Amino acid sequence: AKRISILSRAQSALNSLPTFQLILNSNANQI
Amino acid sequence: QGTQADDLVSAIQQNANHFTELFCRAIDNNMPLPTKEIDYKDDVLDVILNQRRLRNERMLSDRTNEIRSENLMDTPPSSMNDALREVVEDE
C-alpha cells in the first residue's frame, strides 16, 4: 500500500500511512 | 547587473561548517562525467567509489524494473515515470 498510495496522488491530480489491519474470514469447519 | 543576491561571503564566514556540506552537496549535484576510462593504475579508493556508483545505478534499475513489472494500476507517461522515480528513490 505504500507503493500503491505514492503512485496514486501524483497521477490522479505530507501524508502518513498507518500499519494496515488484516481482517481474514473463512468458511471452514465451525468449532 | 542589478539582480538581488544574498551575502554568501558573510554567511560562509559565520557558518563555515554548514557551508562545507552545502558546497559538497552542490558539487555532487552537477558532477561532470569522467572522460578518462578507469584502469588498473588508478587508486583503490577510486575503483571502490566507482563500484559503489555502479551498484547504486544497478539497484535503481532493478527496483524500477521490478515495480514496472508488477504493473499495479495497469494505467500520462510523464506523471507515471515521475511517480515511479520517486517511489524507487525513497524505497
Swiss-Prot record, chain A:
Residues crossing the lipid bilayer are none
Q: Which residues form a coiled coil?
A: none
Cystine pairings recorded for this chain: none
Q: Which domain of life is it from?
A: Eukaryota
Q: Report the subcellular localization.
A: Nucleus
Q: What does this protein do?
A: Acts as a component of the MCM2-7 complex (MCM complex) which is the putative replicative helicase essential for 'once per cell cycle' DNA replication initiation and elongation in eukaryotic cells. The active ATPase sites in the MCM2-7 ring are formed through the interaction surfaces of two neighboring subunits such that a critical structure of a conserved arginine finger motif is provided in trans relative to the ATP-binding site of the Walker A box of the adjacent subunit.
Family to which this protein belongs:
Belongs to the MCM family.
Subunit (UniProt): Component of the MCM2-7 complex. The complex forms a toroidal hexameric ring with the proposed subunit order MCM2-MCM6-MCM4-MCM7-MCM3-MCM5; loaded onto DNA, forms a head-head double hexamer. Interacts with CSM1.
Q: Reproduce the miscellaneous comment text.
A: Present with 10300 molecules/cell in log phase SD medium.
Name of protein:
Minichromosome maintenance protein 5
Origin organism is: Saccharomyces cerevisiae (strain ATCC 204508 / S288c) (Baker's yeast)
Q: Which residues of the full protein are shown?
A: 98 to 146 of 775
UniProtKB/Swiss-Prot annotation, chain B:
Location relative to the cell: Cytoplasm; Nucleus
Note in the entry: Present with 166 molecules/cell in log phase SD medium.
Q: Which family does it belong to?
A: Belongs to the MCM family.
Question: Which purpose does this protein serve, as stated in its record?
Answer: Acts as a component of the MCM2-7 complex (MCM complex) which is the putative replicative helicase essential for 'once per cell cycle' DNA replication initiation and elongation in eukaryotic cells. Core component of CDC45-MCM-GINS (CMG) helicase, the molecular machine that unwinds template DNA during replication, and around which the replisome is built.
Q: How does it assemble?
A: Component of the MCM2-7 complex. The complex forms a toroidal hexameric ring with the proposed subunit order MCM2-MCM6-MCM4-MCM7-MCM3-MCM5; loaded onto DNA, forms a head-head double hexamer. Interacts with CSM1 and MCM10.
The name this protein goes by in its record: DNA replication licensing factor MCM7
Q: Which gene encodes it?
A: MCM7
Give the stretch of the parent protein shown, with its full length. Answer: 95 to 188 of 845
